[PDB]
């Protein structure tokens, strides 16, 4: 048998999956013609990948935590907490990646987080984004059109501004396959493929999460 000691863990794992469920924003949430929407596919129960976008007065990001499981799930919580703390207590995300850096630098769990920061200023149709990871760069424009330029040497352990078209379509991705060949493929598949274009792309062990803006 031995199912008991398992079913209990799965019932415990689910309690953590669902606690992350109410933690992420809903989709597809749109504001002033901007459809913020995402798709996260956890490793069955708990995912270290998290995505959250809120309107300051618009911020957004995609975070991929090292490895997977309970340990990785804990880190995402901190992230969701720190960002909402800055809200209660304008700027550039490069300064926000440093704030998150300090949280992780204390190395409470000794976990480094790779994220894709971004803030769109409805005023002046400008998007300022910072990246601190080796994950697949942002892609925009879908069929009409590519990878956004930016140095992601920064990481959780231890600023590019761009105008925004009317219907341009930007997608942030987790470290999900689906080396150099594989990094050239997804940009093309994204073009070939928004949420329904990414799901077909999706159609594994490590968590799979993607955030699309449009």
């Amino acid at each position: 048998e031995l199912q008991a000691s398992l079913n209990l863990l799965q019932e415990d794992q689910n309690a953590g999956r669902q606690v992350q469920m109410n933690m992420l924003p809903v989709t597809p949430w749109s504001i002033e013609g901007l459809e913020f929407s995402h798709r996260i596919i956890p490793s069955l129960y708990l995912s270290g990948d998290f995505v959250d976008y809120f309107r300051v007065d618009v911020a957004f990001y995609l975070a991929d935590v090292s490895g997977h499981g309970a340990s990785s799930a804990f880190v995402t919580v901190l992230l969701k907490f720190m960002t909402t703390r800055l809200l209660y207590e304008e700027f550039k995300p490069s300064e926000v990646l440093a704030h998150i850096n300090r949280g992780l630098i204390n190395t409470k769990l000794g976990k480094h987080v790779t994220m894709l920061g971004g803030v769109i200023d409805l005023e002046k149709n400008s998007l300022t984004y910072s990246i601190g990871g080796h994950l697949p760069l942002p892609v925009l424009f879908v069929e009409g059109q590519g990878y956004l330029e930016g140095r992601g040497l920064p990481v959780g352990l231890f600023d590019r501004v761009m105008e925004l078209p009317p219907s341009f379509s930007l997608s942030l991705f987790s470290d999900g396959i689906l080396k150099e060949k594989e990094a050239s493929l997804p940009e093309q598949v994204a073009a070939a493929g928004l949420d329904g274009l990414r799901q077909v792309f999706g159609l594994m062990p490590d968590d799979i999460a993607l955030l699309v803006l449009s």
Copy 2:
């Protein structure tokens, strides 16, 4: 990765051990104050957490936190706690103790899993032999062991947005213990009886945490002599 269950247990262990390096070591003593604890998880990870940090040697902080229920969901909340406190440390260029329960309250109040935590805050000053403690829960009051005697300190979470926090100051003779909603682990079946039993058992028991070594159950004991 194997047997599905075994994989979960290997995953659960990764979370248990990640909380291991998160808690302070024991029995850590400073200026004749032995800060030490004993946490016993139920399902690998635990909602019960204990952390005590020195503060320039002038003052010493400490607390015991019991999170609602148990499991992974509860384990997440403890993380926040450990984070918020260490944030105040870096950010405080230095009043009350209960002021910290409110800070933690705001973290949890603002769309954070809708989890309420019952804690026993406390800050002692090594020089003035005084301990100021605030409590915000209906968990088992602190028991202090002095000359083979025991008693609960008087004092009255954060889900409500109202602070409603009261802090009691009390001088300290020449051994304080915090207990979780966990009981009858080592009488049973009565509420008031069971609240009167532990103080007595604590007294009967070796005052030291050494004895202790011999829903989540976690206890923190302090000792001086």
